[PDB]
Design a protein around this ligand. Structure first.
Ligand SMILES: Nc1ncnc2c1ncn2[C@@H]1O[C@H](COP(=O)(O)OP(=O)(O)OP(=O)(O)O)[C@@H](O)[C@H]1O
Ligand SMILES: Nc1ncnc2c1ncn2[C@@H]1O[C@H](COP(=O)(O)OP(=O)(O)O)[C@@H](O)[C@H]1O
Ligand SMILES: [Mg+2]
Lengths: 743, 58, 58
């Protein structure tokens, strides 16, 4: 927001050595035509050019070609600030080095071919590190000016000597600058990047503010999060963007069996960092290197922790070096490291959200060529719990799949590939879908489960139950602004109870796919453990994983196993069963803010579940999944036979009438029996076809009729009364009925 | 209530940094040198100290 | 070895019994082995992928 700041614009005819600005903006900048000016760019890259006046150029834009942008390591649309370069004089001499690859194959002398006519009677200003292109010779050659005399701003006059002698400069510097990690290469961490910028970049640029207010910037930064979230990426980006040497410390590297070796390594690392000031000290796996002294029994670990404390205390000596650490679990670190003068500021790097992972996908796919079919928004949407490293590997795998296809096309025996095949080379949506299928999320690499691909149309009936399930997950995430207007938090709990086989497990499988939210499934008794405090510890780990992977759906199948009424058994399995319920109670509704963790429970017998589990705040809604009625029974048969080819003669409506009390699974068995009979008829038919040499396209009426002879009623009439008593208690507990306000 | 001297030093640093944060949104952040008037206007107030207290834990 | 591989690009590198020279860094008896693994990682990251040199490990 300054007159110097200008938007990046292209050049119609303006070449590398000069710049062109609109005349009104030149007047606002108090600049005359032919004046030398300074360009400021990202990554601490600068160039010196002659300003020009153009009517085509806009006032808010600056006309620069591609090479000028490549000098400053900036792209089109960026914001840069221009300042009139002070006291620019003619150069006594200029030392220019062309790129090593460009000089190859140039028979004529590089200087005579390019530099002699380019700078003849031109007076082109140059700064150190500037690269400029001259057309000529067999191949266009880029020339990098390593040395400027006088440094750094100088004018190249005809009398000024120009020489290209010596080893030509390498493209490695240019490609390292192009691939250098900056703030723009981080995705989804802008909120944390703001605090990191305040911690690092601000004190270096305006120490006068700190000295005026009389405070010192923090020296310790503790980034904590799951692996692959880019904490090391963020640290390296900060080191590169501020022009500081990045020094990497791995926890296993410091660890050594010898006495005094690990602390000596730490001291050497700090000494080298202080010598290379300004620098960033990055300690990967800080938790492994520095645990709690009282908790740890090994002497070497507390030895390392004490040495680290001393190093941090000595660090704040205006050494211009900032120590940063990446850990998975901050609580496992010695609390003495968390105090002021040490890793005082702790920054939480979390799982990227949909827009964050979209940004990560855009960052990693910016160099890849993308067809019109591919859309990164859907790719972000389907990647429910993927992390940035997972997304990068996913893009790489999609590309490699494109190479797999073009390999299947190609022979590879030829040394040179035809240009037409290369033109055919591209990346499409199906490659990214295949990468999605193969890749797995690191957040849930433990709780990954197979997906039976159960979708809503697979479930027949329960249309009212289906609608409620979608709104439970969809409303808080897709429309959070609605909940803030009314102010009441969304409900996050549902219990499914009913006779076996009525569809409780399907609704949990279906809700996993449709709502595009993370899904953690707990088999009923899976969490319990024989150890004293481990059964409850497993409960806290499940609810911690669900909170980290929010929005998450926590499905407790067969909930009656772990959630019993406390006090029913005196022993209670040694009292551990009650302690598990008390742990579950605290996570669902306790002394913490509630994330988008939706707990879903399915049980056959709900009357034994602890009453504290079922109160609003924990499992807010109690939904009864009954035996399907006649209309729903048609839907179940239609949904089950939706995949199989069935004769139009089959009347599914009559089956629903006859099977009065059949469950959803019972109707599924009937279709299964009819399919096997149709398969068995085909198997015997083709055998007769082979015997004579030495049919059944679809399931007819006859197979269903024979199948129904074996149809049984899985759920007894006795059990149904047991479920219907529970639903009646809820109605009587409410009282009154058909509630209406007066008038 | 349970703040050791290091905690109080952290609190004072946080209050000063909060005042600097208040002066952040005004400046362009690309200026070579900061204006003298906003240099003089910078001072720690009770609001910054209360924000630090809200963000202060032993 | 990596310098010769990049000098004679394109080249092919094969490592036999890599696990012998590169055990898990978390549980490693000798510091020299850890530094060897560190040099492995450093040389792997050093290649800018323009060398077109494939490292094979058995
Ligand atoms: N409404 C329905 N629509 C389609 N299939 C159904 C339906 N109800 C049950 N099924 C079928 O019944 C079988 C088992 O259903 P499911 O696992 O959902 O039952 P459940 O009520 O959760 O039982 P349980 O009490 O044993 O856990 C599956 O083959 C499923 O397709
Ligand atoms: N927020 C992010 N934005 C873009 N890329 C990321 C992000 N997080 C991780 N990555 C990718 O993951 C790779 C390795 O990251 P890594 O250092 O393992 O993260 P962590 O610090 O969590 O260990 C990087 O090359 C980067 O491309
Ligand atoms: Mg089930």
């Amino acid at each position: 927001n300054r007159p110097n700041r200008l938007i990046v614009d292209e050049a119609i005819n303006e070449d590398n050595s000069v710049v062109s600005l609109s005349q009104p903006k030149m007047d606002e900048l108090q600049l005359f035509r032919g004046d030398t000016v300074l360009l400021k760019g990202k990554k601490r890259r600068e160039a010196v050019c002659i300003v020009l006046s153009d009517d085509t150029c806009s006032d808010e834009k600056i006309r620069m070609n591609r090479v000028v942008r490549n000098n400053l390591r900036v792209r089109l649309g960026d914001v840069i600030s221009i300042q009139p370069c002070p006291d620019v004089k003619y150069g006594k001499r200029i030392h220019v080095l062309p790129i090593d690859d460009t000089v190859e194959g140039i028979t004529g002398n590089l200087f005579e071919v390019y530099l002699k006519p380019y700078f003849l009677e031109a007076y082109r200003p140059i700064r150190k590190g500037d690269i400029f292109l001259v057309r000529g010779g067999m191949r266009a050659v880029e020339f990098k000016v390593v040395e400027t005399d006088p440094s750094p701003y100088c004018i190249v006059a005809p009398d000024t000597v120009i020489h290209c002698e010596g080893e030509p400069i390498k493209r490695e510097d240019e490609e390292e600058s192009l691939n250098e990690v900056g703030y723009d290469d981080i995705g989804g961490c802008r909120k944390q990047l703001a605090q990191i910028k305040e911690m690092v970049e601000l004190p270096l640029r305006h120490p006068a503010l700190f000295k005026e207010i009389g405070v010192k910037p923090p020296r310790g930064i503790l980034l904590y999060g799951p692996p692959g979230t880019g904490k090391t990426l963020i640290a390296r980006a900060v080191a590169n963007e501020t022009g500081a040497f990045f020094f990497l410390i791995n926890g296993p590297e410091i660890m050594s069996k010898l006495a005094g070796e690990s602390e000596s390594n730490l001291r050497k690392a700090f000494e080298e960092a202080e010598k290379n000031a300004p620098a960033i000290i990055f300690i990967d796996e800080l938790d492994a290197i520095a645990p709690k002294r009282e908790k740890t029994h090994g002497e070497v670990e507390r030895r390392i922790v004490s040495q680290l404390l001393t190093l941090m205390d000595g660090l704040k000596q205006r050494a211009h070096v900032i120590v940063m650490a990446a850990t998975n679990r901050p609580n496992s670190i010695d609390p003495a490291l968390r105090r002021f003068g040490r890793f005082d500021r702790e920054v939480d790097i979390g799982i990227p959200d949909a827009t964050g992972r979209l940004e990560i996908l855009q960052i990693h796919t910016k160099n890849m060529k993308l067809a019109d079919d591919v859309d990164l928004e859907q790719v972000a949407n389907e990647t429910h719990g993927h992390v940035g490293a997972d997304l990068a590997a996913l893009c790489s795998e999609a590309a490699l799949q494109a190479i797999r296809k073009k390999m299947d096309l190609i022979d590879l025996e030829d040394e040179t590939i035809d240009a037409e095949v290369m033109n055919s080379l591209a990346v499409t949506m199906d490659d990214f879908r295949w990468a999605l299928s193969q890749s797995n999320p690191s957040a849930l690499r433990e709780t990954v489960v197979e997906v039976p691909q159960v979708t809503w149309e697979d479930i027949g009936g329960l249309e009212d139950v289906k609608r409620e399930l979608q709104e439970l997950v969809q409303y808080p995430v897709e429309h959070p602004d609605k909940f803030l207007k009314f102010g009441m938090t969304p409900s996050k709990g549902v219990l499914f109870y009913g006779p076996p086989g009525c569809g409780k497990t399907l609704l949990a499988k279906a809700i996993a796919n449709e709502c595009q939210a993370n899904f953690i499934s707990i088999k009923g008794p899976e969490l319990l453990t024989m150890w004293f405090g481990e059964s409850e510890a497993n409960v806290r780990e499940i609810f911690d994983k669900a909170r980290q992977a929010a929005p998450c759906v926590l499905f407790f199948d067969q909930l009656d196993s772990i959630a019993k009424a406390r006090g029913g058994n005196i022993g209670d399995g040694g009292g551990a069963a009650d302690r598990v319920i008390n742990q579950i109670l605290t996570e669902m509704d306790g002394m913490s803010t509630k994330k988008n963790v939706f707990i879903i429970g399915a049980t056959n017998r709900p009357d034994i579940i602890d009453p504290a589990i079922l109160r609003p705040g924990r499992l807010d809604q109690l939904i009864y999944i009954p035996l399907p009625d006649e209309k729903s029974r048609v839907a179940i048969l239609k949904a089950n036979l939706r995949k199989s080819p069935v004769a139009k003669d089959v009347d599914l409506e009559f089956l629903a009438k006859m099977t009065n009390g059949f469950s959803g699974a019972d109707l599924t068995e009937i279709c299964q029996r009819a399919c096997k009979l149709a398969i068995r008829e085909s198997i015997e038919s083709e055998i007769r076809r082979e015997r004579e040499r030495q049919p059944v396209p679809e399931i007819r009426r006859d197979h269903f009729e024979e199948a129904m002879r074996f149809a049984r009623r899985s759920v007894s009439d006795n059990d149904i009364r047991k479920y219907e008593m529970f639903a009646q208690t809820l109605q009587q507990s409410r009282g009154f009925g058909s509630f209406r306000f007066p008038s």
